[PDB]
């Protein structure tokens, strides 16, 4: 339904709270870890420093765990997992697993189209074979 | 001049620090400004105290050891150029470009027949006048510093001489071309003028 | 600013529905009590609920 995924993009901080003094040393991992010591400017938690992770950055409970398309994705192991998904249709998108083989995707793709749950399953299908 | 592409400014009897404030701001506006008549600008106060300040700056310009700067600028165009660098943020690239946009020329540079213009009450006459601890022209400061000056006033004298001739014949021909109103005229039309604006 | 306000927030609440329920029966029974308390008058049923939620320190042998 709602235009609320426009807030999810708008809100952010997709500042991207990375490690930092990351870029200088390769080793420094891209993933965040808290700045323990005083002397860090970041720990003082000003702007321009990179903002820290907290809960308060968190988006609206309704928007969370959704694609930018606004459909909820549920990862779909097989033909069976589709059966719950066809009930959703409009509500849910199905993202078809990395584990999945080509031949299995075919059955799954073909059945999905009849279900009316096109999102990312046709994209994933094109990719594997065509 | 007060537009977007002119920009030519009259230095005669203008205040150095004041000319530089507006000049910097217009270069920050993005104009390319030609400051003309550099020797004729005046900076107020007695010469002796003014020369004492510059003298220390010369004394500074005696060192470092090294070569390659610092500098003290002898001449009226040069003094004025130094003044802009201080006026504008010298740290930044924007500031730097604005500085590249100045040219200061002494006397007149190669003919700008188009008039150089006074800025909104920039001139030292009114801006002295209670008064005048003395007042010092840039040409007076620089005779004591040394000579890019000596050639510049020499040219000023020749430029002013040549132009002063031109202006007399120009004005003669203009009042002549002009006597339009020495009234003619009335012709219903003048009533139209008085109305036309009027309403 | 602050204070009384900060102190109240600084506290806590209050009960708490008991940690773990090994008994399934105890998990629904307590929930049944808050249920009865709220639709009608009964103060006791609301009181019993808290006590069942606390561990060895609230629950009384009689």
């Amino acid at each position: 339904m709602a235009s609320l995924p426009h807030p999810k993009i708008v809100k952010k901080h997709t500042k991207k709270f990375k490690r930092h003094h990351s870029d200088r040393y390769h080793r420094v991992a891209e993933n965040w870890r808290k700045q323990k010591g005083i002397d860090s400017v970041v720990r003082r938690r000003f702007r321009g420093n990179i903002s820290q992770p907290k809960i308060g950055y968190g988006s609206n409970k309704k928007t969370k765990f959704l694609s930018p398309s606004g459909h909820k994705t549920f990862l779909v192991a097989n033909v069976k997992d589709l059966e719950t998904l066809t009930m959703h249709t409009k509500t849910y998108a199905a993202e078809i697993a990395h584990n999945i083989s080509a031949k299995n995707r075919v059955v799954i793709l073909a059945r999905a189209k009849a279900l009316g749950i096109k999102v990312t399953n046709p994209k994933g299908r094109l990719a594997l074979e065509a | 001049m007060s537009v977007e592409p002119v920009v030519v400014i009259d230095g005669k009897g203008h205040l150095v620090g004041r000319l530089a404030s507006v000049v910097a701001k217009q270069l920050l506006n993005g104009q390319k400004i030609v400051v003309v008549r550099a020797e004729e600008l005046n900076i107020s106060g007695e010469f002796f105290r003014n020369k004492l300040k510059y003298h220390d700056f010369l004394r500074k310009a005696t060192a470092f050891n090294k070569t390659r700067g610092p500098f003290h600028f002898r001449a009226p165009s040069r003094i004025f150029y130094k003044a802009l660098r201080g006026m504008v943020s010298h740290k930044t690239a924007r500031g730097k470009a604005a500085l590249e946009r100045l040219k200061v020329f002494e006397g007149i540079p190669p003919p700008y027949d188009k008039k150089k213009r006074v800025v909104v009450p920039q001139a030292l006459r009114v801006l002295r006048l209670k008064p005048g601890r003395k007042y010092t022209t840039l040409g007076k400061l620089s005779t004591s510093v040394g000579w890019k000056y000596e050639d510049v006033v020499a040219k000023l004298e020749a430029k002013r001489k040549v132009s002063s001739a031109e202006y007399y014949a120009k004005k003669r021909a203009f009042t002549k071309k002009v006597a339009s109103a020495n009234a003619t005229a009335a012709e219903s039309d003048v009533a139209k003028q008085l109305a036309a604006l009027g309403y | 600013m602050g204070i009384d306000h900060t102190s109240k927030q600084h506290k806590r609440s209050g009960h708490r529905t008991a940690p773990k329920s090994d008994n399934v029966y105890l998990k629904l029974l307590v929930k049944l009590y808050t249920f009865l308390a709220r639709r009608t008058d009964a103060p006791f049923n609301k009181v019993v609920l808290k006590a069942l939620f606390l561990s060895k320190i609230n629950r009384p042998p009689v």
Binding site: - | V3, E4, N29 | -
Partner: protein, 100 residues
């Protein structure tokens, strides 16, 4: 006496269009609320419109970047005006209050 000089002064940004083929440069549309008098626009044009880039609020990039426009030409002639921007403005700041 004057001319303009004076600060009043509110306006709107209508929208800033950062546009080429690579041919065209950048346009900015401004609509000042009532202001310039028809006369005040016309004898003049070149009135420089300076908006401060401040914190509004929460953390906006609160910088020592004071922004200056100029009116290129009117388009609107009694109201709306064309402007262009030259500098760097803060981030997608169409909307924002115009002002000295």
């Amino acid at each position: 006496m004057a001319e303009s000089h004076r600060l009043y002064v509110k306006g709107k940004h209508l929208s800033y269009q950062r546009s080429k083929r690579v041919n065209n440069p950048n346009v900015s549309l401004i609509k000042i609320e009532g202001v310039a008098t028809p006369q005040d626009a016309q004898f003049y044009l070149g009135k420089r419109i300076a908006y401060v880039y401040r914190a509004s609020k929460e953390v906006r990039g609160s910088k020592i970047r004071v922004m200056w426009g100029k009116v290129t030409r009117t388009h609107g002639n009694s109201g709306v005006v064309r402007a262009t921007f030259r500098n760097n403005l803060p981030a997608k700041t169409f909307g924002a209050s115009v002002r000295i």
